Amino acid sequence: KGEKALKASGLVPEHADAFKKIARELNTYILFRPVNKLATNLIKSGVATKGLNVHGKSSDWGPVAGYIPFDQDLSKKHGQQLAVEKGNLENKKSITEHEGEIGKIPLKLDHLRIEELKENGIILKGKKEIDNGKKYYLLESNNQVYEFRISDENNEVQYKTKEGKITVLGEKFNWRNIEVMAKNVEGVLKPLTADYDLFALAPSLTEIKKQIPQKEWDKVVNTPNSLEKQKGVTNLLIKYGIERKPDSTKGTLSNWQKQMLDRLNEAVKYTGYTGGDVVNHGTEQDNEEFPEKDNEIFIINPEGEFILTKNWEMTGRFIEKNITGKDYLYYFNRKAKINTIPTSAEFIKNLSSIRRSSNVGVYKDSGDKDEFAKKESVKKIAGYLSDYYNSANHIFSQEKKRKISIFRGIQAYNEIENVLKSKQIAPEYKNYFQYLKERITNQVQLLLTHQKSNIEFKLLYKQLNFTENETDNFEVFQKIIDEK
């Protein structure tokens, strides 16, 4: 709500205030994926924020935490058996995919970081063994499996394991350094910490008229059919801005929204960051390996209020109060599910993720009739789910938003129940369809009990028998739900 995030944030304040000025400037919702201090210390010292090259994120241990490893214990994969070699192959494939940018370079850190982390209580300067032509500045940590080995002048950490003990990886070495990769900014060696991130971008409800050159808004608004008016608003935004473009440098947004990401980049160009592109990959769901559920989401609004949520239940609560539930915009992360169900890109990942554990799916890489009737059905599911995940409906009142959203769920539920009414359905795909079916039922019905319409879902489903359209059978849905 302000300062309660500033005291337990782990981020830097100058980026926050220079985001506050652009929040007042072009009125967008800069939603944060907050990271800890162990990367933004060296970010404020001026070392690079990596893109999607290696996925060694903010580790919590050491003055070289946040920094990318070669021996991957210096990341979240700390204490794992086969994941460390998988990350070693990840950096050996990041050199072969992001070549020209990625090298195998020694480090460059500022030496005040060790005295910064004598006071966070992790590292204990203990025994000394003589090497490298000096009294070597050794220090152990709260773990002793791998130490750090720094001289007071050089910017290389030439670590070793203790040869009196054994390792956990299965291999041994001499005092061999963590060779780090880099965002080599035209030959300048810049190693990589866990990057400065985002959670979402969302302008105001009328700044799309200040984002779209509004001479298409000049021809969209004047139209006589109100349902077709909202559909002429919405289909234009599907053909303009839903179609995200991914890369390996900046993240996953559209054209105007990466045009706002360069202003979110100019927020740090004048205040202590020299690594260039500061927004590089966003939230936990902007990660392309597996999702994570974060419990602290730092909302600054178009006013710039330094608000943090409490947990994910309260995060969805605040989202449905103000972020979507007020006159605002929700450009989002594309058996007890209370408020939410996952998304359609999550549905496509879930779709192509489970037909390899079991060889048979009900539709596969084939050429038959019912499998591609099912493909057209599931394309209709994706379209109906894109228009159910739609906060472009507050040009009308919130009752119209709920009406549009659940008519989308009705049309999707019709085909979801219909494709189960088929031949022999594989039980994984059968229970996956029912797994989505019970929750889409409860998502409509929890809306309806949070509405004032009171009908059961099944009666509302059986009174509507739409042929193909949402141009006539929305009027019968209207005349059922209207007058209260």
d(CA 197, CA 19): 13
* Backbone dihedral angles phi then psi of residue 102, each to the nearest 5 degrees: -85, 130
Compute the distance between CA of residue 221 and CA of residue 207 in angstroms, rounded to an integer: 15
Residue 430: CB atoms within 10 Å: 14
Is 394 assigned a ligand-binding role in the annotation?
Answer: no
Q: Assign residue 81 a region: left if phi > 0, alpha if psi is -120 to 50, beta otherwise?
A: alpha
**Residue 139's closest CA among 131, 128, 130?**
128
Is 98 a residue of the active site? no
User: How many residues does this entry show for the chain?
Assistant: 484
- Resolution attained, angstroms: 3.4
Tell me how far apart the alpha carbons of residues 336 and 338 are, in angstroms, rounded to a whole number: 6
Instruction: Provide the Cα torsion 307, 313, 318, 319; round to 10°.
Output: 110
CA nearest to 438, candidates 409, 462, 459, 402:
409
Residues after which the chain has a gap (C–N > 2.5 Å):
334
Q: Is 15 one of the annotated binding-site residues?
A: no
Query: What whole-number distance in Å separates Cα of residue 352 and Cα of residue 345?
Result: 11
User: Which residue, among 120, 109, 113, 69, has the nearest Cα to 92 in the 3D structure?
Assistant: 69
Token pair 């996953």 is found at 252
- Dist. CA 191–CA 56, nearest whole Å: 12
Q: Are 450 and 408 in contact (CB under 8 A)?
A: no
Residues 79/158, Cβ–Cβ less than 8 Å:
no
Say which amino acid occupies 374. K
Task: Give me 337's structure tokens.
Answer: 């599910």
> Could you give the C-alpha distances from 403 to 79, 112, 188, 458, in angstroms and in order?
51, 59, 56, 16
- Pick the closest to residue 432 from 362, 375, 380 (CA basis): 362
Three-class SS string for the chain? CCHHHHCCCCCCHHHHHHHHHHHHHHCCCEECCCCCHHHHHHHHCCCEECCCCCCCCCCCCCCCCCCCCCCHHHCCCCCCCCHHHHHHHHHHHHHHHCECCECCECCCCCCHHHHHCCCCCCEECCCCCCECCECCCEEEECCCCCCEEECCCCCCECCCCCCCCCCCCCCCCCCCCCCECECCECCECCEEECCCCCCECCCCCCCCCCCCCCCCHHHHCCCCCHHHHHHHHHHHHHHHCCCCEECCCCCEECHHHHHHHHHHHHCCCCCCCCCCCCCCCCCCCCCCCCCCCCCCCEEECCCCCCEECCCHHHHHHHHHHHHCCCCCCCCCCCCCCCCCCCCHHHHHHHHHHCCCCCCCCCCCCCCCCHHHHHHHHHHHHHHHHHCCCCCCCCCCCHHHHHHHHHHHHHHHHHHHHHHHCCCCCCHHHHHHHHHHHHHHHHHHHHHHHCCCCCCCHHHHHHHCCCCCCCCCHHHHHHHHHCCC
Where do we find the tokens 């909302």? 299
Using CA atoms in the order 160, 165, 168, 174, what is the torsion angle rounded to 10 degrees?
30
Handedness of CA 310, 313, 317, 320 (dihedral sign): positive
Q: Which of 268, 246, 272, 282 is nearest to 34 (CA)?
A: 282
Q: Measured between alpha carbons, how far is 129 from 131 in angstroms, rounded to an integer?
A: 7
- In Å, how far from its chain's centre is CA 153? 39
CA distance 381 to 311: 31
Angle between helix 370-386 and helix 344-353 axes, rounded to 10 deg: 150
Tell me the C-alpha distance between 183 and 68, whole Å.
11
Q: Tell me: is residue 195 an annotated ligand-binding position.
A: yes
Question: Which two three-digit tokens encode residue 116?
Answer: 């910064």
Q: Is 361 annotated as a binding residue?
A: no
d(CA 135, CA 479) in angstroms, rounded, equals: 86
CA dihedral over 208, 209, 215, 218, signed as positive or negative: positive
How was it solved?
Answer: cryo-EM
Selecting among 55, 78, 98, 394, the annotated active-site residue is 55
Buried b (16+ CB within 10 A) or exposed e, 78-91: bebeebbbebeebb
Q: Is 252 annotated as a binding residue?
A: yes
Question: Scanning the structure block, which residue is given the tokens 């408020």?
Answer: 339
Rounded Cα gap, residues 138 and 439, in angstroms: 56
